[PDB]
From a paper:
To investigate the inhibition mechanism of Lpg2149, we reconstituted the MavC–Lpg2149 complex in vitro and solved its crystal structure. The complex structure revealed that MavC and Lpg2149 bind as a 1:1 dimer, consistent with the molecular weight of the complex measured by gel filtration coupled with static light scattering (SLS) analyses. Lpg2149 has an overlapped binding site with Ub in MavC, but does not interfere with UBE2N binding, indicating that Lpg2149 inhibits the activity of MavC through competing with Ub to bind MavC. Lpg2149 interacts with both the head and tail region of the main domain of MavC mainly through two contacting regions, namely contact A3 and B3. Contact A3, involving the N-terminal long α1 helix (residues 11–38) of Lpg2149, contains six pairs of hydrogen bonds: the sidechain nitrogen of Lpg2149Q16 with the main-chain carbonyl oxygen of MavCG30, the amide nitrogen of Lpg2149F12 with the sidechain of MavCE344, the sidechain hydroxyl of Lpg2149S27 with the sidechain of MavCN39, the sidechain hydroxyl of Lpg2149Y15 with the main-chain carbonyl oxygen of MavCI28, and the sidechain of Lpg2149N19 with the main-chain carbonyl oxygen of MavCT29. Moreover, hydrophobic interactions between F11/F12 of Lpg2149 and N341/F348 of MavC, and between V20/L23/L24 of Lpg2149 and I31/I35/N39 of MavC further anchor the complex conformation. In contact B3 which involves the α3/α4 helix region (residues 70–77/79–82) of Lpg2149, the sidechain of MavCQ38 forms two hydrogen bonds with the sidechain oxygen of Lpg2149D84 and the amide nitrogen of Lpg2149A85. Superimposition of the MavC molecules in the MavC/Lpg2149 and MavC/UBE2N–Ub complexes also shows a rotation of around 6° of the helical-bundle tail region, where both Lpg2149 and Ub bind, indicating a binding-induced movement of the helical-bundle tail region.
Recently, two L. pneumophila effectors MavC and MvcA, were identified as structural homologs of cycle inhibiting factor (Cif) effectors. MavC catalyzes the transglutamination reaction between Ub and UBE2N, leading to UBE2N ubiquitination in an unconventional form. Non-canonical ubiquitination of UBE2N by MavC abolishes its activity in the formation of K63-type polyubiquitin chains, which dampens NF-κB signaling in the initial phase of L. pneumophila infection. Here, we report the structures of the MavC/UBE2N/Ub ternary complex, MavC/UBE2N–Ub (product) binary complex, and MavC/Lpg2149 binary complex, which provide important insights into the mechanism and inhibition of this transglutaminase-induced ubiquitination by MavC.
Residue numbers in the entry:
A (entry chain B): 9 to 114
B (entry chain A): 7 to 381
Write the structure that this text describes.
Amino acid sequence: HMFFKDYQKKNVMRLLQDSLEKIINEWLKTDDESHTKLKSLQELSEMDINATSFAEHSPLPDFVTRLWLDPHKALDAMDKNISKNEIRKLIKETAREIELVFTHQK
Amino acid sequence: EKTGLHVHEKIKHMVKNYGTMITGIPAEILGQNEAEISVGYVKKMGNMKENIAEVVRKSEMTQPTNSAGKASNEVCDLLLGTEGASEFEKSSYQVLSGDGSNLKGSLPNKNLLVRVEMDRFNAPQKYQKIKREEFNPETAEKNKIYLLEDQLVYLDIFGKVIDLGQTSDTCHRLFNAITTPFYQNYILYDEYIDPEESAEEAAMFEMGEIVKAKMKNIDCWTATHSFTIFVPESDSEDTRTLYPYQAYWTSHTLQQWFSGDKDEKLSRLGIDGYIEKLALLGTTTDSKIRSSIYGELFSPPGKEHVFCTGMNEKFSPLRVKFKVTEVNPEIALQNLEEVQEFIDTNYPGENAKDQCELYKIKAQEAMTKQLEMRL
């Protein structure tokens, strides 16, 4: 073995990324004049992987904070070989990609 | 069999039989994820059980993706392994030459995988005649031609103002000739134009010709389709063949590609005939030819003659970018066997159809559980 583990893991994480993009892209359609949502996304994209305080009362979509805080509670079928920190890095990378596209940088 | 050709036969057979299960994504996380993106579709009054059940019934979650890039990534992972695929994906593309010779020369008789990015030429299709004092690049519509008193410029998709090299006299003649109020903000390329009509129509035609000629040296290329081509070496006396593999965004899946046998049908063209069609896609100047070839090579099976008609006629130039790397059949066949063992262990059945049904049952039960929990 070795191939299947890594291949499965990367495909599951791609599935989760697709879900993150769907939910965040819809949510960004209704920002306010202060760009509250965009700013919280930008902050998320560089967030300390050990941080949780922001998620207590965050404008981020509920799925995003639930997946960040405890991904194996949010989706209890998630394999344990996918770490909390791997999920948090995935959330950060997705937030970064979305943010650059949304601000017409990319 | 331990040949590249057997690699082809195996990946085709497995995708044909198992569709989305070839990703190795377990049914339970598939269903839980589907619930998380479906909670809003659940009717919120009535009794919860059958609202949830109704959304679970119309879920398409076991139907495979139709993302071309995802299918190409899946092919690369399976045939190269994950590290090899990542290295291949980060590596450089080459633009296919007019006769396709650089790709042909990149196909020695070994087991090879080609990855292709198709690009379309995203040139401006509109112009505005406007006084310079009113032209603001920060707010004007981007990817558009602007005609000022003595200048002709292109505001590109990035908001950069690019001068199109015409003289003061040329641009002023154009500006002065285009006086009809409805043509101050209009289309560049009119199928029914004619300069012998009037000086105005003369100037509109001439401006279109100038822009088209200048654009040929401006990079308006943008990626538009993704696919792969497996070219096993010839290990018997039979003529060597290639096999294109694809999904098409919003149009069809890799499983539908194989089950319609389009990989094989296109393989019948032969390596040279297929590459000749691919090269003609980049050299032709006729939109009917471009459309017909694009449909032949890239439509869902059976849609070849309606894929690129009407609204979808291929008016813009295309180009083909490619990269090539060697496939080791020992690695690819080991990878595919590991996927097969996962499927047989976790979703047992007497045939592939039954195993697919078990996967769907397990995913739907997971989705039902997750939706009931969130509600």
